[PDB]
Amino acid sequence: CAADSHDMIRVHGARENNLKNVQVEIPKRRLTVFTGVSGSGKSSLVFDTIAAESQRLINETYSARPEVDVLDGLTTAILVDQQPMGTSLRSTVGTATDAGTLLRILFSRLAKPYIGTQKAFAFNVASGGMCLACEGIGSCSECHGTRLSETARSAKIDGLSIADASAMQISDLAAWIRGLTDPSVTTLLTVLGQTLESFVQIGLGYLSLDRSSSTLSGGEAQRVKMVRHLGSALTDVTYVFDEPTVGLHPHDIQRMNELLLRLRDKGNTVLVVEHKPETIVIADHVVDLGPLAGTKGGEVVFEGTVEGLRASGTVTGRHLDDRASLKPSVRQRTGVVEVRGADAHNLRDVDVDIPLGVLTVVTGVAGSGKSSLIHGSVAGRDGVVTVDQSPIKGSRRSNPATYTGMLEPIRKTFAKANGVKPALFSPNSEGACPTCKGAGVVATTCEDCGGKRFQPSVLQYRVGGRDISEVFAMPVAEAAEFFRTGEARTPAACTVLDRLAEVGLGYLSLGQPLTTLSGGERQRLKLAGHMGGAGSVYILDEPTSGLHLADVEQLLRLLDRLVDSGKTVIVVEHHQAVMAHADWIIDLGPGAGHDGGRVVFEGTPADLVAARSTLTGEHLAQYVGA
């Protein structure tokens, strides 16, 4: 029967970015994992081709296009990514979720005194719960950060205003809800109870509803969205995940896995981009991109089962069982950073010494307090370079060449060779495309210049047989060679280019818009940009995100060179390869939220592993084969 015959998503002739005219056959209503080194093409295929085309086909039906030849059997795509859900100064976990609305309804139906409908409990409307002084923003002495008017806070259920309810952990909110007895609101209590418990089940019990949406990690944002999908009655949709193990402790990966398979078993296609073998191995189907990155990847080098992947001899197949060992010895501290009475968030008046001149890895379950400790007590101090995953400013107008400073010497080399002025090859050129400069105008290729960025007057000027648009289109790795010798020789470009290669970004194009970078990409770009000296204490939050096990060895060499040239490196991680490479571990716990906030271990990795006393130590001991 024809109507029941469309059980595969079929791709033919896919060419977005580096993809080499690839083809795949993805089984609908199954979990497919997309593997391969970073820059191999995984997001080009899953996000910029499959999901982008589903989204365009949906968009074209509303009243109000990727490069690929055939895309057959597509369904609606919902992106469950690591982008924030709303970023306004008025978006919280509660405003982004059914929870917050249900809670406002409960309060309009049960709090005393009566004050109105659900909207009297909301800070994103006035006349309305909004505090009039801060306009529901909260930065504010009149509402003490709660965002609500005195009236909105006066209406209470058993002693609790909605501000109190929103301030507690969701695990505590859930218990508060379960203890409410009142026959008027029974179904509402059941419905709110079940959403809250679902937060608890995915492991977000430590968050509060009042948490500002922009302070969530990429992984927390993604998991908050997942609560909605897991509760949704939609079926036959394609849910698309970007590394859903990000921000999860080793103890918590199996729980994420079961969530992904539960989504599938609801009758949905689940597409996951992952590097972690513990998630790869749950797949019904595998698509492996490679062989390597950029112009050296973009091919489907394996497609089949997980057992087929193991036997395939691809770069992913060959590393799938790679598991680090501990160092034979650790470095000796050249000093101490004294942390005294750390009490941000859940931290239980923490005293700890962090060793200088070594690689310290800060570990513990999500919500345990790692970032609260490190950001709160170390980040503000002098000489301390925080390199994180946050967006870069003016990203629409910038690219890796501009952000790092290499573009200027390149423009000088073009100008000197061709008898013209530097500025002719800039965003403010006479010859710049009127409608972009960036070659794109969310981001699609600018039609006026075709992506070339400049009018043909500027493009006639060449160095090494290449115009300036061809240069912007080069990967860092190719540019590293292009600018090394001959007419184009440009030593100050070479300097930055080698650093970008060394942090693992050899695949990025010099002109790639910065808004297309992942958080781990942004962080490695910044890392490269700070390399060259300036300060002596580097803080890196989860620098392995987006890295295949091949790539992590290279980051670990880079961190070793950093420490050995006399710097302190402090890394917050769940990646056990990084843990295994540490000189010193500080483990937070025991659990998340008020079950955590304490240093449960401080010591060498070998002592951690010998004890097996903490969740981190237990997992790490299994990981190193102990």
Added chain:
Amino acid sequence: CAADSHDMIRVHGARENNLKNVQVEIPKRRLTVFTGVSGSGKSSLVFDTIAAESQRLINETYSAFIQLARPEVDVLDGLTTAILVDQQPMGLRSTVGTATDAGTLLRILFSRLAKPYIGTQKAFAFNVGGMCLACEGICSECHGTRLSETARSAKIDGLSIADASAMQISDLAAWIRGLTDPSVTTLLTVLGQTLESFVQIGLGYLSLDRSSSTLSGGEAQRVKMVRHLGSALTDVTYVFDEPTVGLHPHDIQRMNELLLRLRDKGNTVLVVEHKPETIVIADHVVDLGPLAGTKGGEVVFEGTVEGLRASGTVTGRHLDDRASLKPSVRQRTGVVEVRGADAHNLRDVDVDIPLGVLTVVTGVAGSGKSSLIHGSVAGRDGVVTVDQSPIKGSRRSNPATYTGMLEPIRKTFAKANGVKPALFSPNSEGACPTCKGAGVIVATTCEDCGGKRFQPSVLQYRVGGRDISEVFAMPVAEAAEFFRTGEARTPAACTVLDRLAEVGLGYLSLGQPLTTLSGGERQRLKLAGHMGGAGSVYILDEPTSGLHLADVEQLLRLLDRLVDSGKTVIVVEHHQAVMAHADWIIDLGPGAGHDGGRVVFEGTPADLVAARSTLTGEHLAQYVGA
């Protein structure tokens, strides 16, 4: 296999509007036809419940920046993405070319192939590209084409894009097929295919430059269907409202084949229909009834088509109804003389339309029926046009308001309570501050008043035991009696109420927002308003739209009373029961567009059937068993 098990859309506890806690099980990837008399509840179930809930679940996944209340239903399981293929407009600067892929692809073809070169695809667009600066793309400079001189200078084989856009799609497809240039082999195939699909669906007579706002509901629906038939989306629920609208008897089978084509792509197809020739292709039937309004709202049959035939429901009993020709016809009392009619495709038509009788104007879509009637008759004295078009300010109106009865009712409420009429009006200070109409912004129930319309002190004032809120909630058929005798008696309301009953609108509520009326219902509403008044000739464009075969019998009694009281009734129709009942038929043809525009028959239905010499006659002959 749990993932493959969600193969039914399951509705339990549906209570929107008149629905009586209904339940159905709709098979995915099958065609389900929803049948029943007008007002039985079909659209309540299909559009306000099934499709609305799919759309809500999709919308809640969109970011807050991007951005619908749950219908009244208990469980709605197995839902997929839903796309409405309704008779709503697509409009302006909006043409069939701008609304379709065809237009975009045409512009691209011209940018690649046309000489002289003038630019990229947007140099050929009239949304500053190709736009005529004098009229701003809307004219002595561009002669109505909307395009600058430069835009029109660019030629392929002598034709500009204005010429290609002015032609019928059917001639454009042949032209496109005639072009041979290796540069664009692939675009000619893609363009030629989308154009062929316009031809196949029967819209070959349209031109790409036809303004979107001037399409009929049927044409608009078929333009949308071209896009769906070409879409690679699968596992979508496509929801159609009466897709036989505006189709000639000859063209029904082709629309059936396209609906089944859409299913066979791997999609659920939901269709609301009254035409037996389409009903009988269904995989599954859901029949609403027994009758309309409070007498409906139940699922009175669900199952197979053969089941429907045996069922004894109203639908089942009428499935095989074929009207017969009248044994005699009325004699004209005069003639409307049409001379030289040359609107659109009309070939200088001379025709006499008889006065004092029921004339039915027939012929294939695009033959020129509306060009003739609208261009040559609708101008004249004592001619009332009663069409399906939207009514002014419908957002703030309802049947009670539109017909003038709401003010007499407020006076009745005022006198009987020693208050004044304005307390009960939209400009009252007791009216809900954010509505009056009991919904906001499409149409959702208002939170402030909870759908009540007025504060609870206004609803203290009653007549016949009913507050004003309850009066707005009443069906016409109940209002008619409640206002006929007793302490709420209001004669002026009864007069209007009875008129509404007689045009088949007994099920409408008095406060029903006018934006919820279908095209047919608006037409019949306007007809009730005109029936008192002064005209002697009435023009009705497709008044069977939205009518079950049971409701069409009651329409024909009404039309017979209209004519028998001395009025001329001219009806444009494809419904063969109406043609069989006529005094006189004017048939346009032979075909559509430049193959149409001539009167190919004029005479009694009997003489049409005996000649059996046009498409309409051949079909009417088969319809009456000749």
